[PDB]
Design a protein around this ligand. Structure first.
Ligand SMILES: [Cl-]
Ligand SMILES: [Cl-]
Length: 129
């Protein structure tokens, strides 16, 4: 599923991400825009053989099992395919564990490089939330 901006903002809010660990909703929307262009089915392979999955490009090295990332951990205890669902619930619950692990949203390179220190509120401007 390819979300619209306000559609995704509302789904993220309902799943509890607005100000989760201090990150306003616009951060999460910004991150999803640049990680996946709002596409739940996005996958991208990394040089180390791991793969990033879903709307928030969660990495199989640490967070989910794809059966092909040797010596990886599965810290969200889910198959990575669950992160590609049109229901963002699994991606959000795993994202909550990632952002809580000490490095906050710097875990997402696109957020660090394209969202951090910008007007992220602009990403939810005009949405009925
Ligand atoms: Cl915001
Ligand atoms: Cl980047």
């Amino acid at each position: 599923k390819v979300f619209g901006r306000c559609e995704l903002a509302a789904a993220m809010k309902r799943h509890g991400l607005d100000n989760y660990r201090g990150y306003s909703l616009g951060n999460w929307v910004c991150a999803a825009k640049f990680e996946s262009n709002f596409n739940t089915q996005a996958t991208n392979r990394n040089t180390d053989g791991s793969t990033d999955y879903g709307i928030l490009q969660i990495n199989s090295r640490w967070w989910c099992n794809d059966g092909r990332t040797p010596g990886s951990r599965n810290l969200c205890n889910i198959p990575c395919s669950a992160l590609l669902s049109s229901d963002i619930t699994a991606s959000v619950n795993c994202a909550k564990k990632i952002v809580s692990d000490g490095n906050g949203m710097n875990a997402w390179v696109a957020w660090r490089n394209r969202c951090k220190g910008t007007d992220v509120q602009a990403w939810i401007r005009g949405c009925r939330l």
